[PDB]
């Protein structure tokens, strides 16, 4: 139990004690460009902390700075993902040592100030939280927060113990901890996470040493003593024993299940537990409870799932994984968007938000103005929130040129298409514009189901034709499904791949096939629900099984947004792809349920009536007559079987897309399923859900095969596992 | 081996929270006053044979802390060899104190035992003792904690009980409580609370509103709905009961139990203890049982607890003459009536907690003493006492008039 | 009728107040961990036969409020038909939970019952539940309230026990507790407290100071004397014991019980319940008794409680092989030894609360489980368990190895 991990890595901290006795610890990791909490940092901080305890006589203050672009970000994800349940001892001792170093730096009896130049994420803020004073530079792009919950972990370096002490249980949980909210340096000072702000980063350290000289002279007793280390400390909002908090304290876990909708996500409940159980005891005991909960998550499967998808899979896609293996760079000078609907308007926004000159075009100059107005009601609601200025927002709306004339595309080197799914329509619309724009222009098409191979036959330069499937709403949905046609050039992939990164979105590469990958897998999801409804399952259970599985929207509710008559046409197109090939089409039992609602005149919310009942443009409960139509309640299977049916049907269909070449890697399958079809993040993706499965039959791919065979022996042959993972 | 008999059973009038007559009386004084009444009824009783004094208390904090049963033994002048223990089983703490006392007698290791409960909710509010499951996030999240208020609305929504149905039961409870006081059924049982000088403080269950109308209950608001929609307990309860779409908030202030003060005492002993002390038995404990159901609904407990005590005693529903379920919520009683097909002429014949109030720690002993005196008035044989318990628990007790 | 048998008896290591290992563990987790151990010992046990879970708790407030027994049943995954009740009889709450469980079995109305107690004194200090008699002036004045600390000094002053005498008993308690751990008598009984990951937190009674010397105890100060001289409880105690001139303050921190955390569980059931569940009995509850003495001394209770349980079971002091009195104070044990002429080779053979600590709610079950395992090691027959209770009470229990 020391300051070091062992009782030969590099050194990551500099030392500088001026003639006034103010030590300046400048973190500067040589092996990388980001100060990350690794094994080399723990040894460097131990040598620097032990030196502070030995030289405390000739020291009057400490300033913690950094020499990178950012302050300090995250931790060693390579190691936390490998920690097995038997490694919980080393995981517990490691975070205990990291907090023992901070607790010594915190209780040093001298002012310790943090100079936050850039990002302070995860373990970065937890070092600043251990400081008595915090100064942040108001540089755009600097973030401050504890986003450990996104990776399935909790801030186990004093983040929970100190944020609860600074703001209270209620404030710190909902605003800082439970969602991993990232804050600007201006918003951070607003809530108390930052105490002072400076214009540039050069003002940081001289102001930190000026604050220490002021704190020592004006407050000699309380210098270097945190508010919770004083005698009369009173936690904001009270401890769990005070009457004010104890009256509303039972509502905290219930409000958490209300937000998470009963999803099996163990991280947000562990954060709430360590937050309350830490307020009942002292800091040093609270610091140890925070560690025991942290080691419980690291050795768990859900954390390894999220760390695999939200870190390794995301950094691999942004690295250029599924990019063409070797291609150069070609810029974009003018973007042309066809159609001013809900899709074409948002595309013109996210393109113009990245500073791209957009020439929006619909059939009419009237609707083209209403297409730009979609982005106007996005900048106005952003101007009300104070995130952008009037100068920048007027430059964004100045790049979009709505029009109805086809010759205005003269000079466009990147075309976007966003009209209905009609092959003869897309053939003529592209035919009116192919000879107008630059010859090098990319001919992109935002398509849902229509194959890109057939759509490319309507243009002369088929190598420049490609599919760019966005997602509604375009301003927030970050996935872009890039469909690769048979004629599509390899350069066309890179030009669109680089464009997606330029607009801050995550791309995936998909080979042309039926339903692509998102629309193909999300269909099996809504089909499994409609299958249950036809089997006599209660509709209220299907909506709970959908939300408890981890989906953002229940399936029947999604089956109303996705027009019920639109899905009937998808089954018609699939019934044509097989019976025009000779084979006998085997229809899914959900297709008969769709036509049963079509015959009743309830084909989704668009008609004003589907599975729910709608009034004044608002969803108002389920249809009362839905139970008599399908004899609901006649079959009552376990809820865990319903959850596994909607999850396996998507995991099995994802595995088929990997074999059929629809997807190249599993990183595009995991990230593509989450950021697109809405797959539960606790699974880490639809492909990760197979190898990371955990149930009452085992763990891993082997247990997935047994459970899939168990579901197939009771709910149809469609649940049998493919050969790519069988035995 | 030994047979447990109820020799006495008394209780105090039930006050109220807002401007209650018993808000000035310490809860220790409520237990002492009932002990003083037992001496008034049997002055030549050797209190050294009293082996234990068992009290039920759901919030044993402050005035009710420190083994109030022992504080009642010392402050009333009882022999110091009478012990005293306070147990907490939520709303059934009073009935379980009677059960524990009766089971102590059958063991032959105790002769004569006092049992009952006490709860001054106007001085010690409900939940003042904290909560191991409600306040702990890890426990509140793991086991789905949704307060009893919503669990009643969920039963009514599941079993199909309308707002008029629960108001129809709350009305007859106000009537049968007013019919019981007018006929003087409680004159022998209820012991008026008098101060030190002897001046009267309260002599009647003052939470009653006997002039209640069907139209007056419908004008009320479900104060149980805002706490559910704001706290988020509606969605939590529906996550386990996934086959229910919407919770119908039917429970208001006029069809739920009242927050009142009170205390009750029951004298239990063996046949040899009563003969030696010159006491005649008034009832005999046939059998007791403890079971439970799901904790999310929290109130389906009295259904399997009644089935367990009936099969253990070798009886059926037809063999029982009176059923007494604590009227914590109206839908709880209608649920119990539908599960076992109970004729409502045998279900809370002298009203219940909806009109007269529900003191948490003492209700189990109050409704027991009500059934002992009613078996004698009706000259009936068997009576069954049940209570719905927080945490999805259930306790039932069968008594037989002797 | 039915015979009550002890099938299992386990406990946790006892922490300490100042920088205790169990200060981070919620008391609910201490009861759950022992339930997890019982499943580890009997995985093929139908827990639906478990009729009740009775826990003793002297300060049921905050972490220990809200029927922690029920919170232990729901949070451990036990069947919801297992009930749960928390009773408070001061220091004997754990033993009375065993007594109430055993008396429940003899009544035939319960099959298999868990019993024990829990008290995290480092998180919930003693007296946090308030006090009906201590804080009420009318009750504190009428019945003469003088804390247990002075009552021990009064017994030593009355019975003529010197400072060296109580230090001679506190020394042998530190030795016989160190001799018990070295010989491994507690290896089967004590269940180490492990966290969620399984990492060890505490595996030994850490309040012990086995390197205690006779000269080290004499250097201590009676912290029991300043509170008596300032609060004025010396003169109050001497007003009833008027034949005593001066109170000799002999009790310090080294010869009194320690303020420690801990929890214990005992599995009790009928012979038919154990045969059906594949369990073999380890001991049999012969008889229990509840008596008491004067509340001003507060600790002369275990003397008539032992005489009552011996005459009821038809035995004498010579018929008992082991005596186990809770070492709340040294003079309390020397008093009990002199009243009944007990050979000190039969009195707390494996140490006691002076060395290993005294968790209020769980000590009665801890020292009981110590006597069950010691009757098997010694291959003896009968053992008698007693505790001194606040309020001048006393509870004794005789067990017989089977």
Automatic annotation (TrEMBL), chain A:
Q: Name one GO molecular function term.
A: NAD+ binding
Q: What is the lineage of its organism?
A: Bacteria, Bacillati, Actinomycetota, Actinomycetes, Mycobacteriales
**Alphabetized PANTHER family for the sequence:** TRIFUNCTIONAL ENZYME SUBUNIT ALPHA (PTHR43612), TRIFUNCTIONAL ENZYME SUBUNIT ALPHA, MITOCHONDRIAL (PTHR43612:SF3)
Q: Which CDD domains match?
A: crotonase-like
| Residues where CoA 4 binds | 171, 175, 187
Describe the location of the 3-hydroxyacyl-CoA dehydrogenase C-terminal domain by residue ranges: 515-614
Q: Does the keyword Oxidoreductase apply?
A: yes
Q: Which residues form the 3-hydroxyacyl-CoA dehydrogenase NAD binding domain?
A: 335-512
Query: Where along this sequence does the record place binding of ADP?
Result: 639-640
Name of the protein this chain belongs to: Probable fatty oxidation protein FadB
The record lists CoA 5 as bound by 171, 187, 190-191
KW Cell division (keyword) present: no
Where along the chain is CoA 2 bound?
73, 75-78, 123, 148, 182, 315
Entry's family note: Belongs to the 3-hydroxyacyl-CoA dehydrogenase family. In the central section; belongs to the 3-hydroxyacyl-CoA dehydrogenase family.
Which residues are noted in the entry as NAD(+) 1-binding? 340, 342-343, 362, 419, 421, 426, 446, 448
> In which residues is NAD(+) 2 bound?
340, 343, 362, 419, 426, 446
Q: Which UniProt keywords apply?
A: Fatty acid metabolism, Lipid degradation, Lipid metabolism, Lyase, Multifunctional enzyme, NAD, Nucleotide-binding, Oxidoreductase
Question: Which annotated residues bind CoA 3?
Answer: 73, 75, 78, 182
Residues recorded as binding CoA 1, renumbered to this chain, are: 34, 73, 75-78, 182, 315
Q: What GO CC annotations are associated with the protein? A: cytosol; peptidoglycan-based cell wall; plasma membrane
Per the record, the domain of life is Bacteria
Which pathway does the database say it acts in? Lipid metabolism; fatty acid beta-oxidation; Lipid metabolism; butanoate metabolism
Reaction catalysed by this enzyme? a (3S)-3-hydroxyacyl-CoA + NAD(+) = a 3-oxoacyl-CoA + NADH + H(+)
């Amino acid at each position: 139990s020391s300051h070091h991990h062992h009782h030969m890595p590099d050194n990551t901290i500099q030392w500088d004690k001026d003639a006034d006795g103010i030590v300046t610890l400048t973190m500067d990791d040589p092996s990388g460009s980001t100060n990350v909490m690794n094994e080399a940092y723990i040894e460097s901080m131990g040598k620097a902390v032990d030196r502070l305890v030995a030289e405390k006589d000739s020291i009057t203050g400490v300033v913690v700075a950094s020499a990178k672009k950012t302050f300090f970000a995250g931790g060693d994800v390579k190691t936390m993902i490998q920690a097995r349940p038997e490694d919980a001892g080393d995981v517990f001792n490691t975070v205990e040592t990291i907090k023992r170093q901070l607790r010594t730096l915190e209780t040093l009896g001298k002012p310790v100030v943090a100079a936050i130049n850039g990002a302070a994420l995860g373990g970065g803020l937890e070092i600043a939280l251990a400081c008595h004073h915090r100064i942040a530079a108001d540089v755009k792009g600097s973030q401050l927060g504890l986003p450990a919950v996104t990776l399935g972990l909790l801030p186990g370096g004093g983040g929970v113990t100190r944020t609860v002490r600074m703001f209270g249980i209620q404030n710190a949980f909902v605003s800082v901890l439970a969602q991993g909210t990232r804050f600007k340096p201006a918003k951070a000072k607003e809530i108390g996470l930052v105490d002072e702000l400076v214009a540039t980063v050069e003002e940081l350290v001289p102001a930190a040493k000026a604050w220490i000289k002021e704190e020592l002279k004006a407050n000699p007793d309380g210098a270097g003593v945190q508010p919770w280390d004083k005698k009369g400390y009173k936690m904001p909002g009270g401890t769990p024993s005070s009457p004010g908090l104890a009256a509303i304290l039972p509502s905290f876990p219930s409000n958490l299940r209300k937000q998470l909708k009963g999803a099996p996500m163990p991280a947000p409940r562990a954060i709430l537990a360590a937050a309350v159980e830490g307020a009942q005891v002292d800091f040093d005991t609270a610091s140890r409870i925070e560690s025991r909960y942290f080691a419980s998550l690291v050795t768990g499967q859900v954390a390894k799932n999220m760390m695999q998808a939200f870190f390794f899979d995301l950094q691999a896609i942004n690295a250029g994984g599924s990019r063409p293996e070797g291609i150069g760079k070609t810029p974009i000078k003018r973007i042309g968007v066809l159609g001013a609907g809900m899709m074409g308007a948002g595309i013109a926004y996210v393109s113009a938000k990245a500073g791209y000159e957009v020439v929006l075009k619909d059939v009419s100059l009237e609707a083209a103005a209403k297409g730009k107005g979609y982005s106007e009601k996005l900048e106005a609601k952003a101007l009300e929130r104070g995130r952008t200025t009037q100068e920048r927002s007027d430059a964004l709306l100045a790049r979009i040129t709505p029009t109805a004339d086809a010759a205005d595309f003269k000079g466009v080197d990147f075309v976007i298409e966003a009209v209905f799914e009609n092959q003869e329509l897309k053939h003529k619309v592209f035919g009116e514009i192919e000879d107008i724009v630059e010859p090098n222009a990319i001919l992109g098409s935002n398509t849902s189901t229509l194959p890109i191979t057939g759509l490319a036959t309507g243009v002369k330069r088929q190598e420049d034709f490609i599919g760019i499937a966005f997602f509604s709403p375009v301003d927030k949905m970050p996935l872009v499904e890039i469909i690769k046609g048979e004629k599509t050039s390899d350069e066309a992939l890179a030009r669109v791949f680089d464009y997606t990164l330029a607009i801050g979105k995550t791309p995936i590469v998909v080979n042309d096939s039926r339903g692509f990958f998102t629309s193909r897998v999300i269909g099996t999801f809504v089909n499994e629900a409609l299958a249950m409804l036809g089997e006599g399952v209660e509709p209220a259970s299907i909506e709970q099984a959908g939300s408890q599985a981890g989906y953002p929207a229940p399936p029947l509710q999604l089956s109303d947004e996705l027009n019920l008559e639109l899905m009937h046409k998808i089954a018609v197109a699939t019934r044509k792809g097989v019976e025009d090939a000779g084979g006998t089409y085997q229809p899914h039992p959900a297709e008969a349920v769709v036509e049963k609602m079509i015959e009743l005149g309830r084909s989704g919310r668009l008609k004003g009536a589907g599975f729910y009942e709608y009034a004044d443009g608002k969803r108002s409960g389920l249809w009362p007559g839905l139970r008599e139509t399908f004899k609901s309640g006649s079959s009552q299977p376990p809820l865990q079987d319903m959850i596994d049916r909607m999850l396996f049907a998507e995991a099995l269909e994802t595995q088929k897309c990997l074999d059929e070449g629809v997807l190249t890697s599993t990183a595009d399958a995991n990230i593509g399923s989450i950021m697109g079809i809405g797959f539960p993040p606790w699974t880490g993706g639809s492909a990760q859900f197979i190898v990371g499965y955990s149930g009452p039959a085992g763990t891993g791919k082997a247990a997935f095969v047994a459970r899939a065979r168990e579901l197939a022996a009771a709910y149809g042959d469609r649940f049998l596992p493919p050969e790519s993972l069988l035995s | 081996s030994e047979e447990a008999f109820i020799y006495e059973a008394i209780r105090t009038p039930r006050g109220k929270q807002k401007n209650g007559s018993l808000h000035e009386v310490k809860p220790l004084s409520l237990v002492v006053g009932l002990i003083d009444e037992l001496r008034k009824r049997h002055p030549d009783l050797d209190e050294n044979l009293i082996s234990d004094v068992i009290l039920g208390c759901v919030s044993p904090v402050g005035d009710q802390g420190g083994d109030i049963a022992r504080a009642a033994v010392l402050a009333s002048g009882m022999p110091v060899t009478s012990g005293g223990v306070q147990l907490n089983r939520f709303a059934a703490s009073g009935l379980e104190a009677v059960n524990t006392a009766a089971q102590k007698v059958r063991s032959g290791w105790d002769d004569l035992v006092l049992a009952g409960g006490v709860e001054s909710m106007s001085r010690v509010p409900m939940g003042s003792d904290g909560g191991a499951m409600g306040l702990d996030p890890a426990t509140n999240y793991d086991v789905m904690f949704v307060p009893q208020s919503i669990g009643a609305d969920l039963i009514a929504t599941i079993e199909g009980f309308s707002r008029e149905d629960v108001d129809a039961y709350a009305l007859r409870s106000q009537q049968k409580a007013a019919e019981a006081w007018s006929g003087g059924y409680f004159a022998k049982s209820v012991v008026p609370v008098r101060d030190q000088n002897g001046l009267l403080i309260l002599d009647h269950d003052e939470h009653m509103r006997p002039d209640t109308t069907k139209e007056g209950l419908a004008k009320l608001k479900p104060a149980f709905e805002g706490l559910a929609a704001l706290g988020g307990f509606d969605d939590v309860a529906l996550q386990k009961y996934h086959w229910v779409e919407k919770i119908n908030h039917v429970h208001t202030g006029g069809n739920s139990s009242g927050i009142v003060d009170g205390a009750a005492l029951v004298m239990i002993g063996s046949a040899a203890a009563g003969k030696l002390q010159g006491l005649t038995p008034r009832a005999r404990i046939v059998a007791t049982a403890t079971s439970g159901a799901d904790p999310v609904i929290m109130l389906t407990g009295p259904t399997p607890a009644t089935r367990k005590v009936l099969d253990r005693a070798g009886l059926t529903v037809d063999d029982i003459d009176l059923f007494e379920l604590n009227e914590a919520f109206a839908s709880v009683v209608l649920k119990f009536q539908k599960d076992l097909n109970i004729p409502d002429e045998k279900l809370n014949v002298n009203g219940g907690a909806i009109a007269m109030g529900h003191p948490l720690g003492a209700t189990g002993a109050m409704i027991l003493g009500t059934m002992v005196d009613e078996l004698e008035r009706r000259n009936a044989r068997r009576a069954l006492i049940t209570l719905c318990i927080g945490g999805g628990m259930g306790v039932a007790t069968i008594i037989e008039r002797v």
